[PDB]
Design a protein around this ligand. Structure first.
Ligand SMILES: [Cl-]
Ligand SMILES: [Cl-]
Ligand SMILES: [Cl-]
Ligand SMILES: [Cl-]
Ligand code: NA
Length: 129
């Protein structure tokens, strides 16, 4: 599923991400935009063989099981395929665990490089929330 901007904002807010660990909704929407262009089915292979999945490009090296990432962990205790659903619950629940682990949203390199320190509220501007 390819979400609209405001559609994804509303879905994220309903799933508890708004100000989760202090990160306003615009931060999460901005991260999703540059990780996946709002496409739940996005996948991207990393150089070391792990794979990133879903709207927030969550990595099989640590967070989900895809059966093909040797030595990896599955700290969200989910199949990586769960991260590609039209329903964003698994991605949100895993993102909450990631952003709580110590480095906040810097875990998403694209958030650090493209969202951090910018006017992230622009990503929710105009949305009925
Ligand atoms: Cl915001
Ligand atoms: Cl990540
Ligand atoms: Cl594996
Ligand atoms: Cl933080
Ligand atoms: Na894994």
């Amino acid at each position: 599923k390819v979400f609209g901007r405001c559609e994804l904002a509303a879905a994220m807010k309903r799933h508890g991400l708004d100000n989760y660990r202090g990160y306003s909704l615009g931060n999460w929407v901005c991260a999703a935009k540059f990780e996946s262009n709002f496409n739940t089915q996005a996948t991207n292979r990393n150089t070391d063989g792990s794979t990133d999945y879903g709207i927030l490009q969550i990595n099989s090296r640590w967070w989900c099981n895809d059966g093909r990432t040797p030595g990896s962990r599955n700290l969200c205790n989910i199949p990586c395929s769960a991260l590609l659903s039209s329903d964003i619950t698994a991605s949100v629940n895993c993102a909450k665990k990631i952003v709580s682990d110590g480095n906040g949203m810097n875990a998403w390199v694209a958030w650090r490089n493209r969202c951090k320190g910018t006017d992230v509220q622009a990503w929710i501007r105009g949305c009925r929330l």
